Symmetry: C3
């Protein structure tokens, strides 16, 4: 009778050991992770890269007759037939100027390049930048690097490219960061006389705060800043460390592209776009990098834009961009105050030779800074490692039957002898 | 002497095994969890539901003599004696209109319904919606579905109700989302001539971005959008998975409510409120769902409001709403640009036959989109499961005394004799 | 032949036990932690303290000839030679007033000057409502910061009970209508480091346990808008060494009962300024003597800037283990509505332009009646380590602590 109770206890114990052990094994093969959040104080923080664009792609006063000839239909100033669209709400001077520029009689077309047009017709930082201050000391327009985006000629402060050393800040708060007073030059905006999908009614700038390791993607990752306010941006540096497969989904390998030195999801996307357009249309857009020939406005109309839209719509499998394992992101909180005060409106108007109306509808102040001298860390941490797995399997294996690997080896010994 | 030192080692070892084992047991019975954060890239994202209200509950030009008679005191247009308050700082025409509507001389009232009044007097989406675009293609006012909230007649785009399929976006950025130009119709706002509790000075709209599985709750979960700016809302889809008891506190079961098909904490709140008002006052407000009769403005005055306030303070224990285990939330970052530009202001003024003053103080553009084509997941994960408990207990039990469950069974066997 | 493979199996198995066991040992000695996020619903939330400053340090109409004499250079109204700045873009009345006050023919405490000349809450506060009930200016407590005379609602200091809210949403919080008094702003006639073009207020929402640090931790609120602040209460619990880096022991400073990172920072600043210049600035607390404007010019400011740059290691402030933070999302609507502009202009005896350029409404509330908890939790405790070492020790060689003791015995005998 005792051998029966022993047999039932050993059988049930071996069954429980079986299901518990297979439980821990299956849990191990899920490759699970859990998250570790930490806050690290620092005496210094590397200041991020700040890219801003004027919402107006190019200035109206800088457009020439040749530009209307080649890129007039693309720029939406002229219709398909090289004629001005409906003149509704057209200033007499502006309409006479454009009609004169669109004469096109005995006109020998000069050679045309899209990057020349954006480079010269775009808003000049030497004209927009009314004042610059970083950590209380003056900054020059030479700190801003020219970047070409979908929005046109844009500028990146502290880009850290072309051998410039990256700036640091040793104090937090509103004073100890970037602070620029800009004139968006609303007088240079393209006149809108007829409705279009590309037609926009917005006035102001677009800013993206990003690491120097990633290129700007201002059409998607930017936020707006409106004239007439000082906008405060409190930043918090976040350092992210991810896990590669099979735990998570990250690019462990650098997987460096020909266009960009450091891998970033943004660089991977704009790389995919650049390659797709170069293969499909034998030309490259203005914002894209490399050594390919830039597209002509005819190529823009008949190939480039529908090619990108078709790439977006047809299938995402062509462009699959994994996230890198080490990522520095910047968190931000926005607030606003009114500019200028009544006590300063006249002083600004006289300092820059503008009307107080113009100052009111054209001046914006951007104040980007770190809230405090610390950074957050978000790390994916492996939840079950092989040492812990063997420890748990050994513990339960010793609890239920008290056996060891040598014991099973001895049982296989007797099985071999049989 | 060897057996004595052996006895000391066995005693200390058994004590340590005791305290360590009880430690792991108690830690297991705390039912602890820890959090797993992950970020997943996706080729498509299901666009959320977007509900917006005008901050002005109903249009002044659509209020009628009957409306003033029945709900004049409730709408704050008339005083306790059904008479207009002090005419100080009142435009002559504006007051002539109100005084004419409030004559009440030889006036035979008609039947009156609060929901009819909001549906007819509220701001019409066909008039507010100056332009609509989703993923670069035009949308109609018929795409917006009428929902009644505390703010009045409100509208939900991509509501996904009445059999409509939920919309997806295949690209991120400012262009590839919802983008509407709205006219808040500040000329239709209720006149403020005298101080009152209901008096508000704001003009603009209020928006809530929410999952299709939940009804809007704009009076608490909404953010404001001001005229004269194009407001960008960058959204980040978050997928949350919680743990039920005893680990955490979530609703494991569906918890079917009569009013709503899918359970949400918001639906639970307005369910508690609706049930409470139906039980105490036998009527439901306009925003509440169901088949109960709508309240009369007298019922609003003498029962509903004090009942809700008493529900807020006295019965704070009475309404306990548990959070669902799988929740889709949307995070948002707001930014603004100025509208209109000087190059477009006059074109807008002539296109919509308005003065530039009106465009300046009445037009706002709302741009809702996904920052990137990805979503975060925040999961509560069990920190100590029974397999790990048995493994640790077996490990320490085998380290300190080398015993097993069969060993303790044999000790009870020898004790049996 | 069987004993040889048995011996090799024991050797390799003991090697595996060695490397796995030392693996868990090293992992335990990393003292790792992981984060536990939770969301807790509540019937009540303690409402925070809200400190705000006007961006303009002091009112122009309240400055007097004595104030111009003593603090004229510091206030930037007068130059080094006690002369009015460039007369470009100078209001005729303002310039005549300043020239009269700067007559200096036949003609001071910093805190008296800030306390009396600063913006009075009794004039700025056009309306107050908390949870739908009226509040008075007496509810705001005066705190002196770098921006000057500032005010804290629900400060909870001097034994006042902290306010609670039993409902969430825009209505059920603090709601104040303020007039920033842009006419009282210092006239700006020449470029200066202190020269500012902003108009509005700066706010910091913080727990009553920490002092305000509004010049660094504040956000702006612009006139002409009602800005909503949705708050989410977060309760954070960190780990002390060797797990993380926290101050487990409160270690309260003499100035304030409860320790906070901000309080530690301003304490370090006060101590440094007292050591180098034997005086304290207006914002600093304590019983020390306040600086004279000459002391400000020749000692205080360069001492503070040098303290910031020269020795950042000198002030090391550890973070407390229990920290209550408040998250916030801002949004705006336009104020006043066209239907209300006339009523506001007439109610407060101002022009509609003045209302447009001077009135702001601040609405601070909890989005919902819940708070988040973020806990650092120990990932490997000594019980788990001993359990794992015991499990692998029993799996690989099946030994125990008694087995190693007996091996020491048998080795001792032979
Ligand atoms: C991610 O960044 C870390 C540095 O922050 C890189 O190197 C790590 O440096 C720390 C020093 O404290 C070591 O403890 C880690 O073991 C290092 N990790 C590695 C993988 O060497 C790390 O290399 C970076 N990872 C990637 C993929 O670039
Ligand atoms: C309403 O405002 C007017 C103008 O601001 C007040 O009249 C002046 O008030 C100032 C105080 O700021 C006095 O110094 C002037 O002497 C007043 N003079 C004139 C001619 O108005 C007026 O007192 C305010 N109050 C009322 C009830 O009208
Ligand atoms: C101000 O700028 C305009 C720009 O055309 C110029 O014509 C004018 O001469 C300038 N005035 C002064 C005083 O510089
Ligand atoms: C949660 O899962 C259930 C599964 O039946 C589903 O019906 C429900 O819609 C889900 N909720 C959310 C918010 O995804
Ligand atoms: C434009 O509005 C005016 C009144 O503001 C009206 O008289 C006129 O008929 C309107 N024109 C059109 C084309 O609707
Ligand atoms: C620290 O915070 C925890 C979490 O709310 C609380 O339980 C504990 O009492 C706090 N410690 C104190 C107040 O000393
Ligand atoms: Ca500044
Ligand atoms: Ca932070
Ligand atoms: Ca757009
Ligand atoms: Ca994100
Ligand atoms: Ca309100
Ligand atoms: Ca929340
Ligand atoms: Cl997992
Ligand atoms: Cl670690």
């Amino acid at each position: 009778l005792k051998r029966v109770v022993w047999a039932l206890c050993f059988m049930g114990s071996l069954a429980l050991l079986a299901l518990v052990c297979t439980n821990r094994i299956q849990y191990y093969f899920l490759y699970p992770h859990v998250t570790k959040l930490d806050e690290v104080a620092a005496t210094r923080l590397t200041f991020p890269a700040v890219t801003f664009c004027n919402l107006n792609e190019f200035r109206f006063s800088r457009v020439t007759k040749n530009d209307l000839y080649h890129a007039g239909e693309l720029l939406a100033l002229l219709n398909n037939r090289y004629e001005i669209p409906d003149t509704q709400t057209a200033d007499e001077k502006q309409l006479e100027i454009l009609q004169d520029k669109a004469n096109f009689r005995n006109f020998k077309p000069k050679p045309f390049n899209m990057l020349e047009f954006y480079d010269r017709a775009g808003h000049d930082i030497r004209e927009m930048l009314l004042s610059c201050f970083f950590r209380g000391e003056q900054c020059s327009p030479e700190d801003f690097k020219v970047v070409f985006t979908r929005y046109g000629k844009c500028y990146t402060f502290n880009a850290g490219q072309d051998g410039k050393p990256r700036l640091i800040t040793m104090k937090g708060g509103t004073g100890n960061g970037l602070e620029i007073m800009l004139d968006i030059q609303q007088d240079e905006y393209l006149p809108v006389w007829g409705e279009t999908d590309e037609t926009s009614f917005e006035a102001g700038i677009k800013v993206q705060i990003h690491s120097q390791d990633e290129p700007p993607l201002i059409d998607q990752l930017g936020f707006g800043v409106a004239p007439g306010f000082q906008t405060f941006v409190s930043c918090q540096e976040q350092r992210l460390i991810y896990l590669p497969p099979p735990w998570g989904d990250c690019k462990a390998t650098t997987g460096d592209s020909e266009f960009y030195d450091t891998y970033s999801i943004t660089a991977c996307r704009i790389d995919c776009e650049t390659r797709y357009l170069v293969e499909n249309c034998n030309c490259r857009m203005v914002h894209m990098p490399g050594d390919a020939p830039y597209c002509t406005p005819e190529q823009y109309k008949e190939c480039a834009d529908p090619a990108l839209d078709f790439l977006v719509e047809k299938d995402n499998e062509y462009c699959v961009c994994e996230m890198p394992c080490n990522v520095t992101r910047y968190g931000k909180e926005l607030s606003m105050v009114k500019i200028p005060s009544k006590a300063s409106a006249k002083y600004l108007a006289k300092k820059y030779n503008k009307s107080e109306q113009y100052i009111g509808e054209n001046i914006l102040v951007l104040d980007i800074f770190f809230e405090a001298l610390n950074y957050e860390t978000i790390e994916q941490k492996k939840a079950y490692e092989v040492a812990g797995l063997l420890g748990d399997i050994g513990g339960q294996m010793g609890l239920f039957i008290g056996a060891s690997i040598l014991t099973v080896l001895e049982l296989f010994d007797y099985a071999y002898e049989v």
